[PDB]
Amino acid sequence: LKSFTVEKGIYQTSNFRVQPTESIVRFPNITNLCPFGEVFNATRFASVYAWNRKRISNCVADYSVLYNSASFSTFKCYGVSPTKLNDLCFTNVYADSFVIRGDEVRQIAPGQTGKIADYNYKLPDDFTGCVIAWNSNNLDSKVGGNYNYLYRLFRKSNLKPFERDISTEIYQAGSTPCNGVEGFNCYFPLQSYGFQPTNGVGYQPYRVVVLSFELLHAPATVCGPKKSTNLVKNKCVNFNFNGLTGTGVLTESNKKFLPFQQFGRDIADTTDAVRDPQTLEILDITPCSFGGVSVITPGTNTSNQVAVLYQGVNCTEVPVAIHADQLTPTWRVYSTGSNVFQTRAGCLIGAEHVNNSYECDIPIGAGICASYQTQTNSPGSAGSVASQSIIAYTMSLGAENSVAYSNNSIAIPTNFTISVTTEILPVSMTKT
Amino acid sequence: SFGGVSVITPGTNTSNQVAVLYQGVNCTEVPVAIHADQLTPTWRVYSTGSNVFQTRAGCLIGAEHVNNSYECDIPIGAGICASYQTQTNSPGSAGSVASQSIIAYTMSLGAENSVAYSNNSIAIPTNFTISVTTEILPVSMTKTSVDCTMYICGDSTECSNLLLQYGSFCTQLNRALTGIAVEQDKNTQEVFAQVKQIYKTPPIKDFGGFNFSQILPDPSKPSKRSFIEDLLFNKVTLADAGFIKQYGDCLGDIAARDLICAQKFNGLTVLPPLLTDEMIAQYTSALLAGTITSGWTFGAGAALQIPFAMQMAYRFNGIGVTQNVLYENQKLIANQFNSAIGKIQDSLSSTASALGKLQDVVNQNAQALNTLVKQLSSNFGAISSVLNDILSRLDPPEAEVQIDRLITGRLQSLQTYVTQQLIRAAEIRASANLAATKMSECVLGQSKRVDFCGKGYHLMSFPQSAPHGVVFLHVTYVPA
Amino acid sequence: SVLNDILSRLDPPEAEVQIDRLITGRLQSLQTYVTQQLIRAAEIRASANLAATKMSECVLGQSKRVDFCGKGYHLMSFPQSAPHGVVFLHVTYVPAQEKNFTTAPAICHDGKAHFPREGVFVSNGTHWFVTQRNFYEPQIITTDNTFVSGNCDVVIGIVNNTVYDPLQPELDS
Amino acid sequence: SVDCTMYICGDSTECSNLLLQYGSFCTQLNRALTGIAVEQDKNTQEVF
């Protein structure tokens, strides 16, 4: 009101709102995981020059295991946060697994040059993806030496990103025709790596897997895992189902959804009942309790005791809305007590319900009216301050009456009154 | 050349064949619009030929003009009206015959009646009729209240901050609707509350033969409400009742099947009316009670019991027909009136359309809210319609600009809603004041104003409660 | 929020954007205000028309409309000035005290029916009187007051009574 | 009577799509004017 004095009436001071208890994040069931195991825990590894490329798509790819696992020496992701993979989703993912020397491991990164980067396996400058590598001295190395892995010494030109060249043909360095065989100025294009268990760290063969994540407009097939929580019902909660979010009280519904259909909809175009991704249950949509708060007070000149009306709410929510149990005992009294009256309009606290009907001083709603009344017994005294209180009652329509209707009688007045009343009407506004 | 197109549909219930109106266009242009060159030859017939009638309003196709004059069912414009009629048909049996079509004709003002005006002749009615008509007026609207913050910002701290920059827009809007809300309560009080004391009818019904039983509240049925009004509640669509909705029952994608619940979601609340329906009936009972037993006196001050038969003697006195008319034909008049009362019951029961005005009151209001609700889906220029996504996807620096667009749109929408709301309320108020005057003058006394109380020298009226409105049963005198 | 600040603060190329924000908003506020006034003005003008009618009907004459001039059979009104409005001091007739009486729409002198020209039939219990509607004054029911219409058979409620004829005493005397 | 579409967007598809983003502002406005349009006729019938 922006005033120190308040005239009697009902005023809307603020808004009542139940706060959310907890946050729920959800994504669909975990099944249909991409086969990471085939790549990482693979029995055999391809060579650097021709590396294995397994496309991963149509799954929920759970990166967490690779990030968390100790087994890998390094795990570096250029384009996106390595932590982010669980949330992020890519249209297509390619895994390039190859075995290369330890010293060379650094080369597997964007914007790099070297034997692998140029000739072997090239990465885009822009490359978005993560490179995971680990040692395989135990697996790959041979005492005799493991020749199986080759890289390329010569080529007509530099290799483009992700371009692999398997070709066995003899490279002709010079003018002399090779004719398929080595000779002067003719060499097999690839050289092997001599890995042996005895060698040093740099020397050790390492299995590296790079997960490129091509991002296109096209539908994204490979998305991250689902970090979900338990479902709680009959409570105002902050829920996040697959696509949407909102706050309300999830309850069991009696709705029969079609097998394919995920969400319902209001006539209005609202989110009404949703199907839980984990359980095939239909849960109907309810905004959490809230309503207006109106203060019913007598004029400040008369008193300062008030009564509050919580519109369109049950009395039950008010003790829960605030943590009454948590609060001090001074605060506790306000939450519940005999002095609570519930009406159609809402829960009115601070006013005692009264059987007697009187004229309506202040309108509450639903026919209930509040007034400040005290019965007073004092000689030559107006109702003085005493144990006064605020009462709410069904507003009296007035003293009820009846007319002695009959076939044969009339009521004709003997005398009358000349009265004067005032009728007031506005004529004009101020000429602004 | 361009103009609006209107479809004259006789009604799907009745027929599929329709007529199309091209407003303010010459008929010559119609074939060019349609791809006559491209389309099949079946289509070719549809564009050209006779069976095209040119009117001031535009070019009308599908309708056959008729010289004969009829009353106007559906207005075309410029006095032309369209209707679906069948020419004489053969007997009803399978046989090949053609009938039923859409006709456009020159609307008839009605049947011309020349009057034999003369030097010294008078027409003096030998017999009369006590008929009854129904007049329906809206009294109040649904006390809608809207929270700006939830509507615009609904649970978004980042949003509300942006709203504050707007200053006082919300406070006034919330204030405006609240002002409207009180006014409705004021409307209902002024309309019904005309009487201080609440009268109840005596156990004896002997009303000179007049049969009130339909109009009086029926002690019995829940709510002491009357029979005729009971149908009235039935004909209308109550928004909701009970004012209690199970929270849990509500939470997901289905509850918005329950529209009110959805409304509950977006800050849209419906305040209840101060005067409850049960309470409203009592007034209607009282206003009715004093009118029956006391005459007009209850408006002036203390109600004075007067036998009903006596009242008509006064009421006839009001029109310029002496008392002798009533008693001399007391039984008939009562019978006429009682039979008259029954007619409303069938008319009311027969067609929903009797209630059309009230229904309108509900419907525009329903429309306003839904339109208000739907706006939430509009992007306006915004990247998306959901507040969370903007926050989620975009950094605040970028987001602030985006949300701002969304804010202006809804705020504009609410602004359109309230402005629209104020005007309709005013429309209602004038009606309410009109309603109050009708109870004040017509019910509480007998009105002198010709064509105020229904066609005829007005006798009296009995109000009946109705949703957000009131129905009057004007009993008028008409010469037979 | 200050125009002079923005002007002092920014060069025109940049300032134009900021000022534009205020103009669209402020104008919109002003637009809001005007719409409110038009609507509100309509309400007042509606009242003015009513006021004029009240002045027209109530002051200038005695209005017949029940509850137009205040509760009761309206006598008259005295308009009074006021700020931005008017106040009327209606003078209304309200019945104060009442007494029950027994009524019947007519009386039979001859076996014929009499109805009251002005008034209704009542009885003190001993004798029948006919009086005006809103203030009790009994009168001796004479032919001068009553008019003929029909006979006793049709009447409903009619009671036997004696009507006084002023003429007889003149001729007999 | 006023169609928003021409009045605003008049034969510009690029314009009209941008209009749709606006939602129901038009359909409501056109509705009101139509409602207004019928109203006068109602007035005339009531009077005469």
Swiss-Prot record, chain B:
Site residues by UniProt (Cleavage): 95-96, 225-226
Effect of residue 174 to K: In strain: Omicron/BA.1, Omicron/BA.2, Omicron/BA.2.12.1, Omicron/BA.2.75, Omicron/BA.4, Omicron/BA.5, Omicron/BQ.1.1, Omicron/XBB.1.5, Omicron/EG.5.1
Region annotation (Fusion peptide 2) ranges: 245-265
Outcome when changing residue 392 to A: In strain: Alpha/B.1.1.7
Record note on what altering residue 83 to A does: No effect on O-glycosylation by host GALNT1
Segments of this protein annotated with the region Heptad repeat 1: 330-380
Disordered: region residues: 31-50, 83-97, 238-263
Residues carrying a glycan: 13, 26, 67, 86, 88, 119, 127, 211
Effect of residue 91 to R: In strain: Delta/B.1.617.2, Kappa/B.1.617.1
Chain coiled-coil ranges: 359-403
Region: Fusion peptide 1, residue numbers: 226-247
Region span, Putative superantigen: 91-94
Outcome following mutation: residue 90 to A: No effect on O-glycosylation by host GALNT1
Disulfide bridge partners, by residue number: 27-59, 72-81, 148-170, 153-159, 250-261, 442-453
Mutation effect (residue 266 to K): In strain: Omicron/BA.1
Effect of mutating residue 298 to L: In strain: Eta/B.1.525
Entry function: Precursor of the fusion protein processed in the biosynthesis of the S protein and the formation of virus particle. Mediates fusion of the virion and cellular membranes by functioning as a class I viral fusion protein. Contains two viral fusion peptides that are unmasked after cleavage. The S2/S2' cleavage occurs during virus entry at the cell membrane by host TMPRSS2 or during endocytosis by host CSTL.
Name of this protein: Spike protein S2
Shown segment, full-protein numbering: 591 to 1070 of 1273
